[PDB]
Amino acid sequence: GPLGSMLKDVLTSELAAQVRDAFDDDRDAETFLLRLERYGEDLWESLRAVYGDQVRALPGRLLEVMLHAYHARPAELRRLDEARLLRPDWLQRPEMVGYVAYTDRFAGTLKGVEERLDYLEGLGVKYLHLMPLLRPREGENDGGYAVQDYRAVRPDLGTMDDLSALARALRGRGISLVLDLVLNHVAREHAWAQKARAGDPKYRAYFHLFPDRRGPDAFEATLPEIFPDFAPGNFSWDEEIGEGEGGWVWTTFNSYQWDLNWANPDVFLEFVDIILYLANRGVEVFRLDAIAFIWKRLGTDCQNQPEVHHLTRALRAAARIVAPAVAFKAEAIVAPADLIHYLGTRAHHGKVSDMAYHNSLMVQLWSSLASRNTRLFEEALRAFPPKPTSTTWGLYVRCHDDIGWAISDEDAARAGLNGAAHRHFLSDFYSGQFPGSFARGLVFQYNPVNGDRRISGSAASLAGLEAALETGDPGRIEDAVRRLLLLHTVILGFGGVPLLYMGDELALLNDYAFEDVPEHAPDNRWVHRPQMDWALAERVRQEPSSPAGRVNTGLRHLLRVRRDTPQLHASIESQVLPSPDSRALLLRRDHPLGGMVQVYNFSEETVMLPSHVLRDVLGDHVQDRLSGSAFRLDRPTVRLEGYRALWLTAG
């Protein structure tokens, strides 16, 4: 009513006054204010939902950080901001293609990356995700995920000026730089944590600290264990915490990764500042690492609490008021219905993030390759609510992490499977324990208490090439190559930005030499984080008939077809077309110029697919975009040899 109204009035005019006072140039003030009007309600309501009445003390400090970032934003990045506002579906274009790499493994240093831009460009890459490259702690550092200083580049990669000069050279090729925002935890060596241990109460309040086992024991009753092999539980003992003998600190991941206290608005402020600082160095997309973990609540698994989406929305709104070019990409492993909350709900609240990993597509790809059965695939896809049309999936076959078999009991039961049995089969199969498995993966984080296993291994070793090369059997080598190409066809055709993992285009195998690096030995994820093989890159260019060569040639052809296929616009979602044959997966994409049906054989066997399931959708005459040829769907069957993919449209 009036009392509440009047207070809100005073606040608005205080916000307006601080913005106008900050700009000598009135167009800038007007621009800032329009952005604040567009995103203000998402920013403040989200902040009040997490921080309650405290928020009222927040605007001056937060607007201070944003106003300065705005003044500090280079003219060329202001122009990028306008360009992105003019093309809001930029991530959704079929020409978009991503590439994911550790700087040091790909090209040694940031400047070395600049020397490989013709390689990325020759692949049609337009989105480059470099793995965490901020200064990490010395020694073991979870491959850069234990960050010591967010304002410096790891010194052996270069400097913040190299990062900025790299991003400028990327833009000159139409490539977007994409980096991790490691916002859930910092290295125990970060100055925040050093000061908490020295006793500074401002910085003790950045962490979740406990004098004894009571708090920790009470949380642990409902918490899972993420890295049982590295650091049991979710709390670590540290001698230097407090005045006396130490204390317990929350450490979800490694002991040297201290979870940040997101109930403290100072932490929110620090990360606004980090985001805007990195955006002004040229970062265009932020992958929100471990985003699900940022809110703790007693009695829950401390993942996916509602505050996570409020904080994410506020962080984004603050960022884009300053730098509208910036997009956010959530990585959260959660049930489909919940995953959609990381993107947006197309309701009275604003968008939460621009992209999210489609982890369930990745899991089903490997699951169906192992089982030769696509019914679980169909049911896992069918469980998703639709995303907002303006958001975009990131699709992948592999990445820097092990694979967890995130398959729901509910989807599995709809496909006539027991979930637990199927999940157990997938780890037996991909660790190579199941007889006749083609896969060569390593068990990661076996958990004795519950029997949970994840799998490490590169795409080529999981898909059969490492085993096929050992045998020297030409039929095994052929099938491994075809599986690798089928995997990459699905992520290229599914709708979303396909995120090629460095070297998958060369079919790189497990790197068992990680055991010989003490910093890596305990963590077998490093098996699928190889050095780039540039000699191999040159050999496949000159000799395309080898198995690496055929994966390379094949992937490059698929990339060219993807970019010329308008039906792949990511505003449209693939829908399951129920298959009459359990070896095949049929996906339909409706599009203004005519539908597409993508057809995939997940078996080494020749499937004679009954034609009517396709004819009913596309009519009697179709073209396959992938081979260029025709099919007549008036014949009774369509012949799909092992691992065949088709992208059919009418004609």
Ligand X SMILES: OC[C@H]1O[C@@](O)(CO)[C@@H](O[C@H]2O[C@H](CO)[C@@H](O)[C@H](O)[C@H]2O)[C@@H]1O
Q: Which is nearer to a second copy, 46 or 92 (CB)?
A: 92
Question: Phi/psi of residue 181, each to 5°?
Answer: -105, 105
Q: Which is nearer to a second copy, 75 or 535 (CB)?
A: 75
Give every CB contact of residue 210 below 8 A, 6+ residues apart in sequence.
216, 235, 247, 248, 249
Which window, 61-69, 79-87, 407-415, 546-554, contacts a second copy (CB under 8 A)?
79-87
Structure-token match 């596309």, residue found? 618
Give every CB contact of residue 375 below 8 A, 6+ residues apart in sequence.
415, 416, 582
Residue nearest to ligand X (CB): 145
Say whether residue 348 binds a second copy (CB under 8 A): yes
Cβ atoms within 10 A of the Cβ of 440, count?
24
**362/333 Cα distance (integer angstroms):** 11
**432/426 Cα distance (integer angstroms):** 10
Say whether residue 340 binds a second copy (CB under 8 A): yes
Q: Which does 424 bind (CB under 5 to 8 A by kind): ligand X, a second copy, none?
A: none
Say whether residue 390 binds a second copy (CB under 8 A): yes
Q: In angstroms, what CA-CA distances link 67 with 24, 28, 81, 649? A: 12, 10, 16, 50
Please state the closest distance from residue 346 (CB atom) to a second copy, in A. Answer: 5
The residues in 249-288 that bind a second copy, with binding defined as CB under 8 A, are: none
Q: Which is nearer to a second copy, 41 or 240 (CB)?
A: 41
Say whether residue 331 binds ligand X (CB under 6 A): yes
Site string for a second copy, 611-650 (x = CB under 8 A): ----------------------------------------
**228/622 Cα distance (integer angstroms):** 52
Task: Please state whether beta strands 645-650 and 596-601 pair in parallel, antiparallel, or not at all (unpaired).
Answer: antiparallel
Interacting residue with a second copy among 546, 571, 611, 623 (CB under 8 A): 571
Among 394, 388, 345, 395, CA closest to 572: 388
**Residue in 28, 64, 289, 604 annotated catalytic:** 289
Please state the closest distance from residue 184 (CB atom) to ligand X, in A. Answer: 7
Please state the closest distance from residue 343 (CB atom) to ligand X, in A. Answer: 16
Whether residue 42 lies in the annotated active site? no
* Amino acid found at 257: Q
**329/180 Cα distance (integer angstroms):** 9
Structure tokens at 525: 């994820």
The residues in 341-400 that bind ligand X, with binding defined as CB under 6 A, are: 400
Interacting residue with a second copy among 345, 447, 531, 623 (CB under 8 A): 345
| CB-CB contact of 485 with 403 (8 Å) | no
The residues in 581-600 that bind ligand X, with binding defined as CB under 6 A, are: none
Among 368, 347, 344, CA closest to 356: 344
Which window, 36-44, 231-239, 287-295, 503-511, contacts ligand X (CB under 6 A)?
287-295
Q: Which does 8 bind (CB under 5 to 8 A by kind): a second copy, ligand X, none?
A: none
Say whether residue 580 binds a second copy (CB under 8 A): no
The sign of the CA dihedral 602, 605, 610, 614 is: positive
**Residue in 331, 402, 504, 624 annotated catalytic:** 331
Among 106, 113, 168, 140, CA closest to 514: 140
Say whether residue 401 binds ligand X (CB under 6 A): yes
Please state the closest distance from residue 243 (CB atom) to ligand X, in A. Answer: 30
Say whether residue 323 binds a second copy (CB under 8 A): no
Site string for a second copy, 80-119 (x = CB under 8 A): --xx-xxxxx------------------------------
Say whether residue 142 binds ligand X (CB under 6 A): yes
Q: In angstroms, what CA-CA distances link 642 with 18, 50, 605, 638? A: 66, 53, 5, 13
Say whether residue 289 binds ligand X (CB under 6 A): yes
Say whether residue 253 binds ligand X (CB under 6 A): yes
**78/72 Cα distance (integer angstroms):** 10
Which window, 309-317, 385-393, 460-468, 493-501, contacts a second copy (CB under 8 A)?
385-393
Number of residues that bind ligand X (CB under 6 A): 11
Cβ atoms within 10 A of the Cβ of 474, count?
9
C-alpha 59: how far from chain center: 31
Structure tokens at 110: 């940031």
| CB-CB contact of 526 with 441 (8 Å) | no
Q: Which is nearer to ligand X, 137 or 625 (CB)?
A: 137
Say whether residue 30 binds a second copy (CB under 8 A): yes
Task: Please state whether beta strands 327-330 and 355-357 pair in parallel, antiparallel, or not at all (unpaired).
Answer: parallel
Give every CB contact of residue 374 below 8 A, 6+ residues apart in sequence.
368, 579, 582, 583, 584, 585, 600, 602
Whether residue 289 lies in the annotated active site? yes
| CB-CB contact of 400 with 142 (8 Å) | no
Interacting residue with a second copy among 154, 358, 387, 482 (CB under 8 A): 387
Interacting residue with ligand X among 333, 443, 536, 577 (CB under 6 A): 333
Please state the closest distance from residue 499 (CB atom) to ligand X, in A. Answer: 13
Interaction site with ligand X (CB under 6 A): 142, 145, 226, 253, 289-290, 292, 331, 333, 400-401
Interaction site with a second copy (CB under 8 A): 27, 30-31, 34-35, 37-39, 75, 79, 82-83, 85-89, 324, 340, 343-348, 385-390, 566, 569, 571-572, 590-594
Report, as residue numbers or ranges, the catalytic residues: 289, 331
